[PDB]
Amino acid sequence: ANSFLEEMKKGHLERECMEETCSYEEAREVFEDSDKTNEFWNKYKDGDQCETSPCQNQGKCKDGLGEYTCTCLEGFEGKNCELFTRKLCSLDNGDCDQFCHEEQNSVVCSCARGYTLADNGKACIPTGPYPCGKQTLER
Template identity: 50%
Template sequence: MGSSTTSAALLCLLSGVVAAIQTPQTVFLDKQQASSVISRQKRNTGVSNPPASLEQVCMEKVCTYEQARSVFQDSYRTDIFWAVYVDGDQCVEKPCKNGAMCLDSVGGYDCVCKAGFSGVHCEKDETLCPLQKGCSQFCKPGYGSYECSCATGWKLSSTDRKKCEPAVPLPCGKLSSMSRWSERLLSNQRSNFEGLSCSPTECPWQALLKSSESTGFCSGVILKTNLVLTSAQCANKYTQFQVGVGKRRTSYEDGEQSLFVKIVHIHPRYVEGRPENDLAVIEAP
């Protein structure tokens, strides 16, 4: 009987040891468990109430800016919320053009334009040469903006980079008297080349197109020493012609020079009988 009791006690002891080995117990707690044990929950003492939610403050009733800020705790996020809360999101209809960013505000909105665009709604493309209020002489499109330039004898104004001013005393194209030119234009008797007669020093940039069949059938404008601008219909009128420079009349006069035509460049978009793109550049040797 005694031996049976001893054997049973020994068996229980061994079972406990095996169980302890299979399920090992750690002596120390990890950091998270330790923190949860030693940390103490804050209690509501009645001195200050916990912050209310946005729904409680501004959705269930109309709130003030200060009340909204007490929820967001900073001015930046409050301003974004307040702009929409007061009068709705005015950017929802996408008023800004050309990929601009719309910033809603109280009573309005602002468009932040991409490079090369301007205007209230970023509707103006500054990279293209405008037809109205653009460069006074030459214009070249660019990536961020267009660029103005001037003909020989002219320079860009220091106060307005769109306008050209004389760089020499008598640059090509400058009129000595606008009033005399206007009076002559009103009383002009058109000749067969539809031009205005000039005094010797008034129109040195003018040229005259002439052929064996006509002493002068069209006028032109000197661009460079070997380039003359005229209309496409004038350049197509005769297969062979010459360009007279230093002329003021259709008859021969001292100082006249005749240039032979090397090649005629017609505007690629010119359509015969239509006024659009009616341009041609005559190239001399």
């Protein structure tokens, strides 16, 4: 409360945050929503860090308080999304729905009869109403 008349009309964006320094309680009075208040705060205090955008390999960038986040899409990883995602049948069956088998030391998948490999090359699409393993839980 820089001026005592800040919280008498309502939390005003200008009167509290721009013309004066809105405390986070009065910043709430301006917004009354934690997520948008924090997103405002991220550059209300130390600006933006996503504008640098070192997020290689189309890595989506998220700015915060003095920080950025290179959230890497599949096939990319690392601090700035600089490393290809290692595919191995050891972990999560190579992301294959049913079966995995390294060829050229790389993941290629397969599916049981009554199932077909999806276009992603990992998922299995059941082609039968009563397929393998899948319980016939009609009810």
